[PDB]
Design a protein around this ligand. Structure first.
Ligand SMILES: Nc1ncnc2c1ncn2[C@@H]1O[C@H](COP(=O)(O)OP(=O)(O)OP(=O)(O)O)[C@@H](O)[C@H]1O
Ligand SMILES: Nc1ncnc2c1ncn2[C@@H]1O[C@H](COP(=O)(O)OP(=O)(O)OP(=O)(O)O)[C@@H](O)[C@H]1O
Ligand SMILES: C/C1=C/C(=O)O[C@@H]2C[C@@H](CC[C@H](C)/C=C\C=C\CC1)O[C@@](O)([C@@H]1CSC(=O)N1)C2
Ligand SMILES: C/C1=C/C(=O)O[C@@H]2C[C@@H](CC[C@H](C)/C=C\C=C\CC1)O[C@@](O)([C@@H]1CSC(=O)N1)C2
Ligand SMILES: [Ca+2]
Ligand SMILES: [Ca+2]
Ligand SMILES: [Ca+2]
Ligand SMILES: [Ca+2]
Ligand SMILES: [Cl-]
Ligand SMILES: [Cl-]
Ligand SMILES: [Cl-]
Lengths: 361, 371
């Protein structure tokens, strides 16, 4: 009688029962095995010394099915302590998940997990119903990828979704490399995890990258100190923003592509002139990486400089945009009319994978 | 490239091209099969006739309707109809156009499947979609929430739709429609000393029905005026050349939509069922339902029937509530129009159930629509 909501992402797996204000279980989307029968989640973490951690979900898409099965096995039985052949499951996916991909996912749930019924929703679309809209422009910047999904009354326009392969994780590797030069150690997978913390605690986006990269020399009351688990301390400079900035200047990491602000545009324009007014009016921030302070107003500015002088622009960055996707998953699956949207195990048996394709949401 | 919108009804088939304000083709849903001939010899099988082709030689051929009360009971004859609809009426190649098919509220899934299976197998349509008549009659009136009244020739469904979705449990199906009303006006005419009984005579009473008949507000306030004055009718010149006049009978006929007692039935009246529906719904929305009532169907074409409802229900529902009766002038084809609109829209491209899909999934796929 109680459905499940499992938002598996390149970095974190967000699980929980529908109708709950937040994901109950939240663990790393990793899977370890003897460095040469297989550990997973927060457990695998504590055995890094003798393991070889692999993220199954790569850039939002599933690339290692054998390990995903284990993540889901662990997600049901260990993390949630529940019976899969007893609960309707809602799984999220990434914009443009290749048909084949999704077809597989559906099969595994039935064939190998016996889900009574299930459904697959688009991460992006969900964050939107979580913000409270059916039409808009979503920005999903997490660990794996960063997408911009434009949605007209519930339907995301595939012809205009932009995929920026830089995100949260990538930002850490950069935060690292800019701390080796300002004199400091850091370089192993284990250490990588501490950068991720500084990156999550200090770093912030700035309005004027230059009127802030100048204050660097002058004052100094713009930075702070970080007490690492080693007891040793560190002082951080311009890095506090020369890091998230990348999101806007994918040059510091080489990359190539346009900044998140630009693509957010380069997408809106790939849409039909009619909806545009609403798409600029409803810009939704979603995903962990969209947490750096100032990223809100920064975007705000940076794009109104692309947009027509005659057009309202509203950036929406909800406080819980960290678990945004999950929430909408929860909400949606608790909705009355969704009931008839699930895909029964029976319907599966007769029709097969494919059926999981036409949805509506 | 251009979608086909075919509305299959108990008595008439409305088929046309998307984007048109009216169905190009409208023929009767029947098939003629030269009397008896249920033995060997006289070989050749005599073949069958469909549509207008039929009638015009009916004398020596028995007619059967494939759609009974809105549901398809004879696939064989139906196929034929569809064939005729594409090649002989619309004059097109079913393999080149996507088709939108209408169904009756609560159409048996088995059917929908058979229906979808036949369209893809015996016709090779590039893609199709099945819509619920009522819903379309609603989309065409310009709403996504309200209660629709579909009184056609073989059925009078009463469907409550909210935001584009029909509410199953809250649907009333009244096995009483136009065809019935005809048989009746035909009975009370031999009560005023007359004839008419051959299937060919039925067709004229139907003409007499659609021409004079009307629905008076208060029944026993007009019936009186019947015995009093006489300025309540007129006369009609049939082929016979002769002439007939019908007092009382003009309204005493459609009054069955309200007083099913008149022919037995024993089912509450259309005005009643309409209530019993709004009731079975969720109290939170009954408000939005009473203001969005929609008349749709050939039988909803009587003059005055509009206001007879305005009255007949206000009397049954909470005084504290504005009621609205929306009876568009086209309700005669409304079902189609809605579908025509539908088929001709961007957001719909997704909705079509392409063959490629049917090819890998089968009938079972024509169930996930959400409109
Ligand atoms: N408060 C914060 N400030 C900045 N970055 C944060 C914060 N909290 C989490 N993050 C970052 O956002 C990234 C994570 O997001 P999310 O939880 O959005 O990823 P997923 O959903 O796990 O992955 P994907 O987005 O690739 O599908 C993390 O890798 C982390 O570096
Ligand atoms: N102007 C009119 N006045 C009265 N009755 C009419 C009028 N026009 C049509 N009808 C009656 O309504 C019936 C037709 O409706 P419709 O076109 O509603 O039927 P269908 O769609 O053919 O059948 P069904 O809806 O029962 O499945 C006709 O067969 C006729 O008896
Ligand atoms: C609180 C937390 C959050 C999180 O998002 O973890 C994800 C998952 C994690 C898996 C690998 C590590 C060793 C194992 C366990 C980590 C546990 C908890 C870490 O790899 C990330 O760290 C990467 C690396 S660098 C970055 O930017 N993302 C993001
Ligand atoms: C103008 C017209 C309208 C119509 O709706 O016809 C439909 C179809 C028709 C088919 C049978 C007849 C003999 C053959 C051809 C008729 C052609 C046109 C008839 O049988 C109905 O008449 C019956 C009889 S009485 C009634 O209520 N339905 C409804
Ligand atoms: Ca995510
Ligand atoms: Ca947890
Ligand atoms: Ca779409
Ligand atoms: Ca009809
Ligand atoms: Cl990596
Ligand atoms: Cl708001
Ligand atoms: Cl009959």
């Amino acid at each position: 009688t109680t459905a499940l909501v499992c938002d598996n992402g390149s970095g974190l797996v967000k699980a929980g029962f529908a109708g709950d204000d937040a994901p109950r279980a939240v663990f790393p989307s990793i899977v370890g095995r003897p460095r040469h029968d297989s550990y997973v989640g927060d457990e695998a973490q504590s055995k890094r010394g003798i393991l070889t951690l692999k993220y199954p979900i790569e850039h939002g898409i599933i690339t290692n099915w054998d390990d995903m099965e284990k993540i889901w096995h662990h997600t049901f039985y260990n993390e949630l302590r529940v019976a899969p052949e007893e609960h309707p499951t809602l799984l999220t996916e990434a914009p443009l998940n290749p048909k084949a991909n999704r077809e597989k996912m559906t099969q595994i749930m039935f064939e190998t997990f016996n889900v009574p019924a299930m459904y697959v929703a688009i991460q992006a679309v969900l964050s939107l119903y979580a913000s409270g809209r059916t039409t808009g422009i979503v920005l999903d910047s997490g660990d794996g990828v960063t997408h911009n999904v434009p949605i007209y009354e519930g339907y995301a326009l595939p012809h205009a979704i932009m995929r920026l392969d830089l995100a949260g994780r990538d930002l850490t590797d950069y935060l690292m490399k800019i701390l080796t030069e300002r004199g400091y150690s850091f370089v192993t997978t284990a250490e990588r995890e501490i950068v991720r913390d500084i990156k999550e605690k200090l770093c912030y986006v700035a309005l004027d990258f230059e009127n802030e990269m100048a204050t660097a020399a002058s004052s100094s009351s713009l930075e702070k100190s970080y007490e690492l688990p080693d007891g040793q301390v560190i002082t951080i400079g311009n890095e506090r923003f020369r890091c998230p900035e990348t999101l806007f200047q994918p040059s510091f990491i080489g990359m190539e592509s346009a900044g998140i602000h630009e693509t957010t545009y380069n997408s809106i324009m790939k849409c039909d002139i009619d909806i545009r007014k609403d798409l600029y009016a409803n810009n939704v921030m979603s995903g962990g990486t969209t947490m750096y302070p100032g990223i809100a107003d920064r975007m705000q500015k940076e794009i109104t400089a692309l947009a027509p002088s005659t057009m309202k622009i509203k950036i929406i960055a909800p406080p819980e945009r960290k678990y945004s996707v999950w929430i909408g998953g929860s909400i949606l699956a608790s909705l009355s009319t969704f009931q008839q949207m699930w895909i029964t195990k029976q319907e599966y048996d007769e029709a097969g994978p494919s059926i999981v394709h036409r949805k509506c949401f």
